[PDB]
Nanobody, 119 residues
Framework: EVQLVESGGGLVQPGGSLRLSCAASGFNIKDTYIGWVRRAPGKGEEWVASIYPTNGYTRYADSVKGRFTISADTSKNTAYLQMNSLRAEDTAVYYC?????????????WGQGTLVTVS
């Protein structure tokens, strides 16, 4: 079965950086759009960023443009989210997700997520 193996959360002060990692299990990231959503306190899900590793196409939510960068290493079958210039309002649990070519979720279950705390 497909699994998303997530890591890289942590605790930093505003202005600091983290890098999230999402390693694919049960599929190749070349076959897919992969990226992150986050769940902050009191909110629904917010899409953050996505990449199509085959050609490197990326797209970002306006809320993170210029601060976060999404990337992929196909030889590691892993995607990354570099988060620079973190703000307190970036505190959330971040989840890796797959989307199909229809822009809609393409995995059966959420992974366990990774916590990013900015304070």
């Amino acid at each position: 079965e497909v699994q998303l193996v997530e890591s890289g959360g942590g605790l930093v002060q505003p202005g600091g950086s983290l890098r999230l990692s999402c390693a694919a299990s049960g599929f190749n990231i070349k076959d897919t759009y992969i990226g992150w959503v986050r769940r902050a306190p009191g909110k629904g899900e917010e899409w953050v960023a996505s990449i199509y590793p085959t050609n490197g196409y990326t797209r970002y939510a306006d809320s993170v443009k210029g601060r976060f960068t999404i990337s992929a290493d196909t030889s590691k079958n892993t995607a990354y989210l570099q988060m620079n210039s973190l703000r307190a309002e970036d505190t959330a649990v971040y989840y890796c997700a797959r989307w199909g070519g229809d822009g809609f979720y393409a995995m059966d279950y959420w992974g366990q997520g990774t916590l990013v705390t900015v304070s």
